[PDB]
Amino acid sequence: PLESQYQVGPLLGSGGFGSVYSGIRVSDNLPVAIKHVEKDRISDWGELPNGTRVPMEVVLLKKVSSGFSGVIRLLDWFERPDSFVLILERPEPVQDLFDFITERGALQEELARSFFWQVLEAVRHCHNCGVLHRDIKDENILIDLNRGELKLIDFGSGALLKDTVYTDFDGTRVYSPPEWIRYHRYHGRSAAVWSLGILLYDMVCGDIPFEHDEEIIRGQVFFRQRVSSECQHLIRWCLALRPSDRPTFEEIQNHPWMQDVLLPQETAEIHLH
Numbered sequence: 706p707l708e709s710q711y712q713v714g715p716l717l718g719s720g721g722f723g724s725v726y727s728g729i730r731v732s733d734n735l736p737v738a739i740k741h742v743e744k745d746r747i748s749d750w751g752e753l754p755n756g757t758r759v760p761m762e763v764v765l766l767k768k769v770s771s772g773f774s775g776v777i778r779l780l781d782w783f784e785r786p787d788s789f790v791l792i793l794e795r796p797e798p799v800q801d802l803f804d805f806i807t808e809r810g811a812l813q814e815e816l817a818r819s820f821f822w823q824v825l826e827a828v829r830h831c832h833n834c835g836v837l838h839r840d841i842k843d844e845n846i847l848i849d850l851n852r853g854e855l856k857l858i859d860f861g862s863g864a865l866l867k868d869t870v871y872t873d874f875d876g877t878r879v880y881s882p883p884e885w886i887r888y889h890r891y892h893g894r895s896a897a898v899w900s901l902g903i904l905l906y907d908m909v910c911g912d913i914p915f916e917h918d919e920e921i922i923r924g925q926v927f928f929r930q931r932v933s934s935e936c937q938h939l940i941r942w943c944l945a946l947r948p949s950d951r952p953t954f955e956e957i958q959n960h961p962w963m964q965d966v967l968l969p970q971e972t973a974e975i976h977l978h
């Protein structure tokens with residue numbers, strides 16, 4: 706019933722995460738994305754309410770689904786002899802944040818504020834649903850160019866949220882915290898806040914602040930573009946070497962730089978159209 710239900714379009718991307726194709730749901734013409742992942746390549750397995758062994762991404766995406774549009778929606782999934790296929794809602798027109806930044810350079814602060822705020826709302830929703838993403842980065846954020854809404858994608862490195870230490874990690878290394886680099890140990894929320902600091906620097910400077918393990922461990926931030934004192938302060942706080950020196954999500958969103966965010970539609974009108 707997979708090839709019956711969907712018309713497959715072009716390949717959108719492929720890499721460590723699998724292969725993702727553009728698609729259309731035949732029944733009603735809904736734009737979709739079709740993600741294929743080989744069974745051998747699946748690092749983390751989970752189990753459904755009725756106890757079926759699936760990729761962790763399937764478990765996690767079901768835990769987050771609801772009216773909220775900050776996280777990509779899982780529409781369906783299929784098992785094959787050597788692979789799983791995931792059907793995801795696809796915004797149209799769309800561009801990932803990595804490509805958007807590559808083309809436009811460093812983002813104006815007003816725009817970064819709107820985008821960052823929306824990423825924070827999406828991550829908070831994940832956590833509230835018991836889900837930890839573990840790979841927050843520009844490549845995992847899609848921009849709905851008409852409505853100015855961002856969507857978090859790719860939960861294939863994620864895990865159930867817990868309060869004890871994680872000792873496994875398969876997300877993106879240059880967004881990973883110094884405690885992972887040094888000790889192979891981290892806690893969920895504080896590691897997430899570190900990756901959010903990396904992301905915010907990326908938005909306002911047009912590139913990530915650290916390339917090497919030694920730079921992550923030193924944690925010394927240098928600004929290559931003109932960035933406001935308040936934005937610099939928030940970034941440096943997110944990037945505190947000691948996990949307990951990092952702000953809570955509440956503290957980030959109450960920070961002075963985060964006041965007076967634009968609504969998504971205002972953001973599209975001013976910055977995207």
Ligand SMILES: NC[C@@H](NC(=O)C[C@H]1CNC(=O)c2cc(-c3ccnc(F)c3)cn21)c1ccccc1
Nearest residue numbers: 717718719722725738793794795796799801858859
């Ligand atoms: N290099 C850009 C490419 N990114 C990926 O394929 C990343 C891939 C990583 N892992 C995923 O789970 C995943 C889902 C999607 C996706 C999801 C929903 N709509 C889309 F258009 C794309 C895309 N991803 C992309 C091209 C065109 C539109 C969107 C994205």
